[PDB]
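Quick one: co-fold with magnesium ion.
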Amino acid sequence: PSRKFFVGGNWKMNGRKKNLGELITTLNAAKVPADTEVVCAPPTAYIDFARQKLDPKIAVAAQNCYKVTNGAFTGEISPGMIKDCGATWVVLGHSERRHVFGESDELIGQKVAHALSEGLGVIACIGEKLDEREAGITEKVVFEQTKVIADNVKDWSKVVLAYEPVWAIGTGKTATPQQAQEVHEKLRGWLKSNVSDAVAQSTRIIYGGSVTGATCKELASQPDVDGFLVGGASLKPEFVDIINAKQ
Amino acid sequence: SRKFFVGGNWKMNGRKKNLGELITTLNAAKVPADTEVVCAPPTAYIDFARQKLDPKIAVAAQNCYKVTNGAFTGEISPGMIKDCGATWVVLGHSERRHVFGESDELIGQKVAHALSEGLGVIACIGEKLDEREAGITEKVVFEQTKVIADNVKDWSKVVLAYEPVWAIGTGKTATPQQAQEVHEKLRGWLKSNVSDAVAQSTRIIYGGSVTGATCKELASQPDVDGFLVGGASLKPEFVDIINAKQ
Ligand SMILES: [Mg+2]
Ligand SMILES: [Mg+2]
Ligand SMILES: [Mg+2]
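Sure, here it is.
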């Protein structure tokens, strides 16, 4: 067919019922354009609340999960719980999980496999740090992260890859369109060489890292950029602008 | 005297149907006025559990982070816990320390922030088998408690929970004497390092294996003030554990 544009909003650790409820009302009233898939990832305490308040046109994602269905893992949640709350996606391998919390590639792979086996979709995050970019090892870094993810994916129809260069997260330093395109094209080439043409052609690779209303149109114009995983702007009315990046 | 305290840690178990069924049975139970009961659901169900549980049972989160909002994908803050109607958070649980590698420094920062946002804290401590066998039970639990105490101004909203991690999946089994031994030392630690008033007023609850069959003997120990219950908290015998002071 042709890759459906994908816009995810990662609220991170922000919001309460009152102000997230006001956010959700605004999103509910927005017209979601054709061939566009919108997903919001609330704080874990509000997955249920957000699913109840959001229009079904918008899917709900968890911001993380663990790798078994139930167990002695105080503070964690499972894909089963996520499904049970009406959510259909999980974000895995986010930069903050890797770099603030130290989650290993191996662990992230195990979570991807479990989440997929349980019937969730996965937004799987990769990305290099400034020091890695400056050393010229971007490709090595992101290919290695992608490989561990791929080793644990048996159905790519339920996966979206999110490239979020760590130097672009929370800094205002959005990748230029050319920079995002360069990495996205390389990641798609990796899928083609290492999985299949069909998987390469159908898998959304979305860009994250200071996506704003002012920058989204030029980014979305790049041939191998299939949408966004949005951070700070996901909490504001300009998220709707980003949803309309191809209009 | 110290009010008997029974927490149920559901860990990463349950869905709306079976947790809703568990809650129905808890609402039906006579919760004694002399016992403080708290349930800690999985984080996806804090809100659900608070909405379904009778006000006689308080709700706790199983963890939180150390600032009120921020770019911490997968975390929740004390403000969110409070906003969901929960009034406690469990911090420093053995699984957070030993499966997920949370440091004492981070646990102390979480303690300070949680208390600053008006939550109660169930602060967990405990030594692993290799620490016990190296003779450093005391150094380990005292240093854990010191970090906690360094981040507590008002102990009225804190409960300490001792977890004999050395008896978890090691093939070792903790006796009531061994529980009492540690609890008595922890109270002595508070007396000498914080104040006698804090030592006498602070609940120190037992976070090792407890069941309906064993709860009365454990609760009879002079320095055991209740329980942070694991697996039995999902079962009918939790109602009996709630009645273990009497
Ligand atoms: Mg990595
Ligand atoms: Mg160089
Ligand atoms: Mg070919």
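If it helps, The radius of gyration of chain B is 17 Å.
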